[PDB]
Short mmCIF file of C-alpha atoms and ligand atoms in Angstrom, two decimals:
data_model
loop_
_atom_site.label_atom_id
_atom_site.label_comp_id
_atom_site.label_asym_id
_atom_site.label_seq_id
_atom_site.Cartn_x
_atom_site.Cartn_y
_atom_site.Cartn_z
CA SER A 2 22.85 18.00 21.45
CA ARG A 3 21.58 20.20 19.51
CA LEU A 4 22.31 19.51 15.83
CA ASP A 5 24.04 15.81 15.30
CA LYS A 6 22.94 13.92 12.34
CA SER A 7 21.38 11.56 15.33
CA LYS A 8 19.60 14.45 17.34
CA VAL A 9 18.16 16.00 14.24
CA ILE A 10 16.74 12.94 13.22
CA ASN A 11 15.56 11.91 16.61
CA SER A 12 13.66 15.42 16.94
CA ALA A 13 12.04 15.09 13.41
CA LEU A 14 11.00 11.51 14.41
CA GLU A 15 9.25 13.08 17.66
CA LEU A 16 8.14 15.88 15.02
CA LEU A 17 6.60 13.21 12.76
CA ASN A 18 4.27 11.66 15.46
CA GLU A 19 3.08 15.14 16.46
CA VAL A 20 2.27 16.69 13.11
CA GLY A 21 2.37 13.78 10.57
CA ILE A 22 4.12 13.61 7.30
CA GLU A 23 2.42 16.52 5.32
CA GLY A 24 2.61 18.76 8.33
CA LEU A 25 6.14 17.99 8.92
CA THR A 26 8.45 21.17 7.88
CA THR A 27 11.98 21.99 8.22
CA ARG A 28 10.67 25.37 9.61
CA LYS A 29 8.98 23.40 12.60
CA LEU A 30 12.10 21.35 12.88
CA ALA A 31 14.08 24.37 13.56
CA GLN A 32 11.42 25.95 16.16
CA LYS A 33 11.67 22.57 17.92
CA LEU A 34 15.25 22.56 18.03
CA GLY A 35 15.72 26.32 19.12
CA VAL A 36 17.76 27.22 16.10
CA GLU A 37 17.25 29.58 13.18
CA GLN A 38 16.39 28.25 9.83
CA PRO A 39 19.62 29.18 7.91
CA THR A 40 21.52 27.23 11.06
CA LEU A 41 19.24 23.97 10.32
CA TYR A 42 19.50 24.38 6.71
CA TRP A 43 23.18 23.96 6.95
CA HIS A 44 22.32 20.48 8.18
CA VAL A 45 19.27 19.30 6.50
CA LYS A 46 18.93 21.10 3.33
CA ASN A 47 15.10 20.45 2.50
CA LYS A 48 12.05 18.15 3.59
CA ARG A 49 12.74 15.50 0.69
CA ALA A 50 16.41 15.13 2.60
CA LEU A 51 14.71 15.05 5.92
CA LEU A 52 12.64 12.16 5.02
CA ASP A 53 15.11 10.26 3.13
CA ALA A 54 17.12 10.17 6.48
CA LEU A 55 13.77 9.42 8.57
CA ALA A 56 12.96 6.24 6.36
CA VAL A 57 16.38 4.76 6.82
CA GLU A 58 16.32 5.36 10.68
CA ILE A 59 12.59 3.90 10.80
CA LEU A 60 14.34 0.56 9.35
CA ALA A 61 17.56 0.92 11.31
CA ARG A 62 15.94 0.98 14.70
CA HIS A 63 13.16 -1.37 14.55
CA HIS A 64 13.10 -3.67 11.28
CA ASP A 65 15.30 -6.11 13.22
CA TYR A 66 14.54 -9.19 10.84
CA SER A 67 15.61 -7.80 7.61
CA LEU A 68 18.00 -11.17 7.17
CA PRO A 69 17.69 -14.38 7.57
CA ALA A 70 19.46 -16.67 10.58
CA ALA A 71 21.46 -19.69 10.05
CA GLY A 72 19.60 -22.77 8.99
CA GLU A 73 16.11 -20.59 8.49
CA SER A 74 13.62 -22.17 6.17
CA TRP A 75 12.76 -19.15 3.53
CA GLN A 76 9.19 -19.45 4.58
CA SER A 77 10.38 -18.60 8.04
CA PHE A 78 12.42 -15.78 6.61
CA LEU A 79 9.40 -14.11 4.78
CA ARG A 80 7.07 -14.62 7.56
CA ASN A 81 9.54 -12.93 10.29
CA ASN A 82 10.80 -10.41 7.93
CA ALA A 83 7.25 -9.02 6.87
CA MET A 84 6.17 -9.30 10.71
CA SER A 85 9.18 -7.41 11.29
CA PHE A 86 8.77 -4.66 8.37
CA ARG A 87 5.13 -4.03 9.50
CA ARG A 88 5.72 -3.44 13.17
CA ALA A 89 8.61 -1.16 12.05
CA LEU A 90 6.32 0.92 9.80
CA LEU A 91 3.60 0.90 12.52
CA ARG A 92 5.95 2.61 15.16
CA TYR A 93 5.81 6.09 13.86
CA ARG A 94 2.68 8.26 12.55
CA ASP A 95 2.52 7.98 8.58
CA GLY A 96 5.38 5.56 8.95
CA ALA A 97 4.51 3.95 5.63
CA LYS A 98 3.97 6.96 3.79
CA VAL A 99 7.57 7.90 4.78
CA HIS A 100 8.99 4.45 3.63
CA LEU A 101 6.93 4.90 0.35
CA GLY A 102 8.02 8.70 -0.73
CA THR A 103 11.77 7.72 -0.47
CA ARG A 104 14.18 5.80 -2.89
CA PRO A 105 16.21 3.03 -1.40
CA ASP A 106 19.39 3.71 -0.58
CA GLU A 107 23.09 1.41 -0.21
CA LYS A 108 21.47 -0.30 2.99
CA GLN A 109 18.05 -1.55 1.50
CA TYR A 110 19.90 -2.31 -1.60
CA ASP A 111 22.63 -4.31 0.18
CA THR A 112 20.23 -6.19 2.25
CA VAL A 113 17.83 -6.80 -0.74
CA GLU A 114 21.00 -8.47 -2.17
CA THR A 115 21.70 -10.97 0.60
CA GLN A 116 17.96 -11.80 0.58
CA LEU A 117 17.79 -12.64 -3.25
CA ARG A 118 20.96 -14.71 -2.66
CA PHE A 119 19.32 -16.30 0.23
CA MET A 120 16.34 -17.04 -1.95
CA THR A 121 18.13 -18.34 -5.07
CA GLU A 122 19.93 -20.85 -2.82
CA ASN A 123 16.42 -22.34 -1.55
CA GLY A 124 15.58 -22.84 -5.13
CA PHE A 125 14.11 -19.75 -6.58
CA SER A 126 15.01 -18.52 -9.58
CA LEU A 127 16.25 -14.32 -9.36
CA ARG A 128 12.52 -13.51 -10.77
CA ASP A 129 10.58 -15.68 -8.60
CA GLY A 130 12.71 -14.77 -5.42
CA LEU A 131 12.25 -11.40 -6.16
CA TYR A 132 8.64 -11.36 -7.05
CA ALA A 133 8.53 -13.25 -3.54
CA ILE A 134 9.91 -10.86 -1.74
CA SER A 135 8.18 -7.62 -3.43
CA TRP A 136 4.75 -9.30 -2.88
CA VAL A 137 5.48 -9.73 0.71
CA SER A 138 6.55 -6.09 0.71
CA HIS A 139 3.29 -4.72 -1.48
CA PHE A 140 0.74 -6.69 0.90
CA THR A 141 2.48 -5.60 4.05
CA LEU A 142 2.72 -1.87 3.06
CA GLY A 143 -0.74 -1.79 1.97
CA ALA A 144 -2.03 -3.18 4.85
CA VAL A 145 0.09 -0.90 7.28
CA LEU A 146 -1.02 1.98 5.00
CA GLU A 147 -4.50 1.26 5.40
CA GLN A 148 -3.98 0.85 9.21
CA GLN A 149 -2.33 4.11 9.59
CA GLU A 150 -4.81 6.42 7.23
CA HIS A 151 -7.83 5.15 9.49
CA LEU A 166 -24.48 -0.74 7.22
CA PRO A 167 -25.32 -3.88 5.53
CA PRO A 168 -25.90 -7.43 7.32
CA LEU A 169 -22.82 -9.65 6.32
CA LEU A 170 -20.09 -6.89 6.41
CA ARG A 171 -21.42 -6.05 10.04
CA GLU A 172 -21.49 -9.20 11.24
CA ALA A 173 -17.76 -10.20 10.01
CA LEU A 174 -16.76 -6.48 11.26
CA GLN A 175 -16.94 -7.58 14.85
CA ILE A 176 -14.14 -9.80 14.28
CA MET A 177 -12.03 -7.55 11.96
CA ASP A 178 -12.10 -4.67 14.58
CA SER A 179 -11.03 -6.04 17.77
CA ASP A 180 -7.57 -6.26 16.77
CA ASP A 181 -5.65 -3.89 14.55
CA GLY A 182 -5.29 -5.55 11.28
CA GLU A 183 -2.59 -8.41 12.55
CA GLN A 184 -4.95 -11.36 12.34
CA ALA A 185 -5.89 -10.53 8.58
CA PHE A 186 -2.17 -9.59 7.68
CA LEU A 187 -0.88 -12.72 9.34
CA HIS A 188 -3.52 -14.97 7.71
CA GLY A 189 -2.80 -13.50 4.22
CA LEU A 190 0.87 -13.66 4.49
CA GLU A 191 0.46 -17.38 4.82
CA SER A 192 -1.96 -17.95 2.20
CA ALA A 193 0.96 -16.22 -0.36
CA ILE A 194 3.90 -18.30 1.52
CA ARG A 195 1.62 -21.55 0.64
CA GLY A 196 1.15 -20.09 -2.65
CA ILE A 197 4.96 -19.95 -3.38
CA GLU A 198 5.38 -23.27 -1.96
CA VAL A 199 3.14 -25.10 -4.53
CA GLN A 200 4.68 -22.95 -7.49
CA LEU A 201 8.34 -23.75 -6.06
CA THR A 202 7.51 -27.38 -5.80
CA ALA A 203 5.67 -27.70 -9.19
CA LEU A 204 8.73 -26.81 -11.29
CA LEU A 205 8.24 -27.13 -15.10
CA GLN A 206 4.78 -28.83 -14.07
CA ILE A 207 1.22 -27.31 -14.97
CA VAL A 208 0.13 -26.18 -11.64
CA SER B 2 -20.94 23.69 -17.62
CA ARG B 3 -19.47 25.46 -15.22
CA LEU B 4 -20.11 24.07 -11.41
CA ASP B 5 -22.52 20.95 -12.37
CA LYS B 6 -21.12 18.11 -9.55
CA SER B 7 -19.85 15.96 -12.52
CA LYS B 8 -17.97 19.02 -14.01
CA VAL B 9 -16.25 20.01 -10.68
CA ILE B 10 -15.43 16.54 -10.61
CA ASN B 11 -14.24 16.28 -14.31
CA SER B 12 -12.29 19.63 -13.94
CA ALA B 13 -10.73 18.33 -10.53
CA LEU B 14 -9.64 15.00 -12.09
CA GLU B 15 -7.76 17.08 -14.70
CA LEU B 16 -6.10 19.13 -12.18
CA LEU B 17 -5.19 16.00 -10.11
CA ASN B 18 -3.05 14.75 -13.21
CA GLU B 19 -1.57 18.26 -13.66
CA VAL B 20 -0.61 19.00 -9.76
CA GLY B 21 -1.14 15.63 -7.96
CA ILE B 22 -2.71 14.98 -4.58
CA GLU B 23 -0.88 17.31 -2.13
CA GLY B 24 -0.95 20.10 -4.85
CA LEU B 25 -4.63 19.84 -5.41
CA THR B 26 -6.44 22.72 -3.81
CA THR B 27 -9.87 24.16 -3.87
CA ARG B 28 -8.28 27.53 -4.76
CA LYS B 29 -6.47 26.04 -7.99
CA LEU B 30 -9.80 24.41 -8.81
CA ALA B 31 -11.79 27.75 -8.77
CA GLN B 32 -8.84 29.13 -11.03
CA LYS B 33 -9.10 26.51 -13.48
CA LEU B 34 -12.72 26.70 -13.14
CA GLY B 35 -13.00 30.69 -13.86
CA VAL B 36 -14.99 31.07 -10.72
CA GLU B 37 -14.38 33.20 -7.34
CA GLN B 38 -13.43 31.14 -4.20
CA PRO B 39 -16.63 31.69 -2.41
CA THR B 40 -18.75 30.86 -5.43
CA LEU B 41 -16.97 27.14 -5.52
CA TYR B 42 -16.98 26.75 -1.63
CA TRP B 43 -20.80 26.83 -2.29
CA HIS B 44 -20.33 23.90 -4.14
CA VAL B 45 -17.28 22.29 -2.63
CA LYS B 46 -16.65 23.37 0.76
CA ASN B 47 -13.07 21.66 1.31
CA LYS B 48 -10.55 19.48 -0.13
CA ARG B 49 -11.63 16.85 2.06
CA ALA B 50 -14.71 16.76 0.12
CA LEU B 51 -13.37 17.06 -3.03
CA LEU B 52 -10.96 14.19 -2.54
CA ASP B 53 -13.85 11.98 -1.31
CA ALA B 54 -15.50 12.83 -4.48
CA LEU B 55 -12.76 12.07 -6.54
CA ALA B 56 -12.20 8.47 -5.07
CA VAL B 57 -16.05 7.74 -5.69
CA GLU B 58 -15.44 8.96 -9.33
CA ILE B 59 -12.41 7.20 -10.33
CA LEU B 60 -13.94 3.50 -9.28
CA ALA B 61 -17.25 4.37 -10.87
CA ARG B 62 -15.56 5.22 -13.99
CA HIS B 63 -12.98 2.94 -14.32
CA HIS B 64 -13.66 -0.37 -11.61
CA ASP B 65 -15.72 -1.94 -14.05
CA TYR B 66 -15.18 -5.73 -12.61
CA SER B 67 -16.55 -4.81 -8.93
CA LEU B 68 -19.08 -7.38 -8.78
CA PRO B 69 -19.17 -11.13 -9.96
CA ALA B 70 -20.58 -12.51 -13.11
CA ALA B 71 -23.21 -15.04 -13.48
CA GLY B 72 -21.60 -18.71 -12.49
CA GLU B 73 -18.03 -17.28 -12.31
CA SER B 74 -15.59 -19.10 -9.81
CA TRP B 75 -14.35 -17.24 -6.75
CA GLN B 76 -11.04 -17.36 -8.12
CA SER B 77 -11.72 -15.72 -11.37
CA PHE B 78 -13.69 -13.18 -9.33
CA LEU B 79 -10.75 -11.93 -7.09
CA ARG B 80 -8.33 -11.93 -10.12
CA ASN B 81 -10.95 -9.92 -12.28
CA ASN B 82 -11.63 -7.69 -9.31
CA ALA B 83 -8.00 -7.23 -8.51
CA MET B 84 -7.03 -6.58 -11.76
CA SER B 85 -9.88 -3.93 -12.33
CA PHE B 86 -9.00 -2.14 -9.24
CA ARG B 87 -5.29 -1.72 -10.09
CA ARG B 88 -6.35 -0.31 -13.58
CA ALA B 89 -8.71 1.94 -12.00
CA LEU B 90 -6.06 3.37 -9.40
CA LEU B 91 -3.70 3.73 -12.14
CA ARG B 92 -5.48 5.87 -14.40
CA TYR B 93 -5.14 9.14 -12.72
CA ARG B 94 -1.80 10.55 -10.95
CA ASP B 95 -1.96 9.83 -7.10
CA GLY B 96 -4.77 7.77 -7.48
CA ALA B 97 -4.26 5.24 -4.79
CA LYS B 98 -3.18 8.09 -2.54
CA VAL B 99 -6.79 9.38 -3.24
CA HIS B 100 -8.40 6.12 -2.57
CA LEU B 101 -6.31 5.25 0.59
CA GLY B 102 -7.28 8.89 1.86
CA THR B 103 -11.01 8.57 1.82
CA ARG B 104 -13.55 6.49 4.02
CA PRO B 105 -15.63 4.29 2.25
CA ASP B 106 -19.25 5.50 1.08
CA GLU B 107 -22.69 3.41 0.64
CA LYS B 108 -21.29 2.50 -2.65
CA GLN B 109 -18.06 0.59 -1.59
CA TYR B 110 -20.28 -0.74 1.19
CA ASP B 111 -23.21 -2.10 -0.57
CA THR B 112 -20.40 -3.56 -3.08
CA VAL B 113 -18.34 -5.16 -0.49
CA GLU B 114 -21.66 -6.73 1.01
CA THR B 115 -22.41 -8.36 -2.27
CA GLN B 116 -18.77 -9.87 -2.71
CA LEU B 117 -19.03 -11.08 1.06
CA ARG B 118 -22.24 -13.17 0.13
CA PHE B 119 -20.63 -14.21 -2.81
CA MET B 120 -17.62 -15.49 -1.05
CA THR B 121 -19.88 -17.17 1.61
CA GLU B 122 -21.97 -19.12 -1.04
CA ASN B 123 -18.49 -20.44 -2.32
CA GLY B 124 -17.69 -21.87 1.06
CA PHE B 125 -15.97 -18.99 2.83
CA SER B 126 -16.55 -18.50 6.46
CA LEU B 127 -17.62 -14.51 6.59
CA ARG B 128 -14.03 -14.10 8.17
CA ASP B 129 -12.16 -15.80 5.78
CA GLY B 130 -13.97 -14.17 2.73
CA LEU B 131 -13.46 -11.11 4.41
CA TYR B 132 -9.71 -11.68 5.02
CA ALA B 133 -9.53 -12.75 1.00
CA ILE B 134 -11.02 -9.95 -0.17
CA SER B 135 -9.06 -7.41 2.29
CA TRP B 136 -5.74 -9.06 1.26
CA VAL B 137 -6.26 -8.98 -2.36
CA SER B 138 -6.96 -4.89 -1.80
CA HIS B 139 -4.09 -4.64 0.49
CA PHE B 140 -1.65 -6.25 -2.12
CA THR B 141 -3.19 -4.06 -5.13
CA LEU B 142 -3.16 -1.04 -3.21
CA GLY B 143 0.66 -1.81 -2.02
CA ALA B 144 1.87 -2.58 -5.58
CA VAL B 145 0.16 0.40 -7.40
CA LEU B 146 1.21 2.92 -4.56
CA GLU B 147 5.06 1.89 -5.04
CA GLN B 148 4.41 2.14 -9.17
CA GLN B 149 2.72 5.30 -8.57
CA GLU B 150 5.22 6.78 -6.48
CA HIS B 151 8.49 6.22 -8.05
CA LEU B 166 24.26 -1.38 -7.21
CA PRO B 167 24.86 -5.32 -6.42
CA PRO B 168 25.11 -8.21 -8.40
CA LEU B 169 21.99 -10.00 -8.15
CA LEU B 170 19.73 -7.43 -7.80
CA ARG B 171 21.24 -5.92 -10.91
CA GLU B 172 20.55 -9.04 -12.89
CA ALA B 173 17.04 -9.51 -11.91
CA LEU B 174 16.20 -5.85 -12.26
CA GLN B 175 16.56 -6.44 -16.40
CA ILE B 176 13.02 -8.16 -15.81
CA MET B 177 11.22 -6.24 -13.19
CA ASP B 178 11.56 -2.93 -15.14
CA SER B 179 10.56 -3.53 -18.97
CA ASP B 180 7.02 -3.65 -17.65
CA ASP B 181 5.52 -1.27 -15.18
CA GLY B 182 4.51 -3.86 -12.10
CA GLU B 183 1.91 -5.97 -14.15
CA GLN B 184 3.68 -9.28 -14.22
CA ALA B 185 4.94 -9.40 -10.35
CA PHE B 186 1.63 -8.50 -9.39
CA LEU B 187 -0.24 -10.65 -11.58
CA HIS B 188 2.30 -13.54 -10.53
CA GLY B 189 1.60 -12.78 -6.53
CA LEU B 190 -1.99 -12.50 -7.05
CA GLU B 191 -1.77 -16.46 -8.15
CA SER B 192 0.11 -17.28 -5.40
CA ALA B 193 -2.27 -15.94 -2.91
CA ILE B 194 -5.39 -17.41 -4.65
CA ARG B 195 -3.63 -20.93 -4.65
CA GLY B 196 -3.03 -20.24 -0.92
CA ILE B 197 -6.75 -19.43 -0.43
CA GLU B 198 -7.63 -22.66 -2.51
CA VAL B 199 -5.44 -24.78 -0.25
CA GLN B 200 -7.03 -23.27 3.13
CA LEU B 201 -10.49 -23.45 1.77
CA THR B 202 -10.19 -27.45 0.68
CA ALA B 203 -8.44 -28.19 3.80
CA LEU B 204 -11.47 -27.26 5.93
CA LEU B 205 -10.65 -28.51 9.85
CA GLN B 206 -7.54 -30.72 8.56
CA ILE B 207 -3.97 -29.68 9.46
CA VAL B 208 -2.70 -27.98 6.24
CL1 LIG C 301 22.55 21.30 23.62
CL1 LIG C 302 -20.35 27.35 -19.03
NA1 LIG C 303 10.81 3.18 -0.40
NA1 LIG C 304 -10.06 4.10 1.02
#
């Protein structure tokens, strides 16, 4: 009904699944909604505006582990947050590309602030706390982007394991390797590690 | 001169820097080259073909640490290869997007085969060897993609450090955390770690 912000966004998310991020246009949204382009332009000025809104919505609907639980270890937080971020990005076609193409908003910023506070209370310097969250982000993004976009002996015989599964195993394994690296760096303090 | 494969690719790389990946079109390449569209179509059928060629070329020109040196430790290999991959992707506008949007070729495949052999001779199972290389890839890709695409207390006071530098420090730090994670998993063998 018909041009509520929430309805434009929901039709635009449907459209995103049909046509992908490069195909998504305000012209096709207006057609989908049954409305003339000037009518829609009142509500959504351009594709950049649209895409910004979609990015926010994807995370608001699906990124349910954005914040640490009470008593939770920093390791669990990063593991749960990473898994949640990946799931959220995998829900819509080109979901990672939508996330990438947008500047953060007051939400992301506010959420990241609480995450930095959390990490610092657990012994991280601001910088290592920030490097940690960023790395998990970059790693999760790269994995999903590769998953969503799309012969020699050894590569063959390993691929029978990488391909009965859509990236999760590798992602989860790499995530544990990083976490343990952070644990080791954290615990070393001023010592050579 | 004028439509050699190598000359089409070099003009197309120049064009990529001017207009970016979504703007890049065979129509603008033909204009740049001074040739009619049917003439160019003989040589390059479509943008997908073009982009595939560009992806290969970027790595061939700049990804100079694709293979391990004689006597090199697996840790050095992953560190040097990662740094090389990131540098190569940062050379052209939308370079990571160009890399992402392409299926690998006989080169990438052949190179990855030699990397798997290398990793396996250093104690990695095929799967952990493969997970390792993939993670480094995903992490490097995510970082560069974020770098190439584009206020609360603690985020502020950390950002004065993340932003006098274009991602390298964070990237290098996260890379060491992963490597140490792999070292720990490698060394544990069948023990609880
Ligand atoms: Cl209605
Ligand atoms: Cl000439
Ligand atoms: Na973003
Ligand atoms: Na690729």
